[PDB]
Each structure stands twice: as structure tokens, then as C-alpha cells.
Amino acid sequence: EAGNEGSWFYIQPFYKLRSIGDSVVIGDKVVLNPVNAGQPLHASSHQLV
Amino acid sequence: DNPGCNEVNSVNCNTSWKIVLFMKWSDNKDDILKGGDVVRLFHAEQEKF
Secondary structure, rough: OOOOOOOOEEEOOOOOOOOOOOOOOOOOEEEEEOOOOOOOOOOOOOOEE | OOOOOOOOOOOOOOOOOOOOOOOOOOOOOOOOOOOOOOOOOOOOOOOOO
């Protein structure tokens, strides 16, 4: 709730069409990684109980 | 050298050179596509075809 540091997310293009400095269009595919984790946030396949 | 090949001279004989247009002035800007540009079609990801 308080806004922990580490919620900063680099926005980085997944497609090779776009590059750093290009404005993001609505509806494209993008990958998100934190500023100080270096691990892109993904959706796993391990179901919960 | 060539079968259909008539040369061009300069005498007093009469002829008519029809000025048939191809591209207007102010369409020869270097920053836009034109109807005679030579381009190579690079794929955004892999390589040119």
C-alpha cells in the first residue's frame, strides 16, 4: 500500500520493431522487468491449492 | 548492335518531342517514398528477403 521501493518497472519492447526512445502504442506486446531485480515478471504455470 | 535501335541526330528535319510527365516538382523530396526509388525489404526481425 505504501509504495515500496522496488515497484519501479522498466518498460522494454518485446518485439524487435520498436526500440528505446520510441513511444509506446496501445495494444502492443511489452515485457516488464524491475529496476533492481533484473528478472522479467512472468506468469508461471504452477497452480495454487 | 541491336535489332530495334534507331539513333538520334541533329539536322533541319522536323520532329515532335511530347513532354510526358513522370513526377512533379516538390515530390522529389529525399525523405519520402517515390515511384522510382530502389529499396531493400529488411525484415524487422530476421533478415532481408
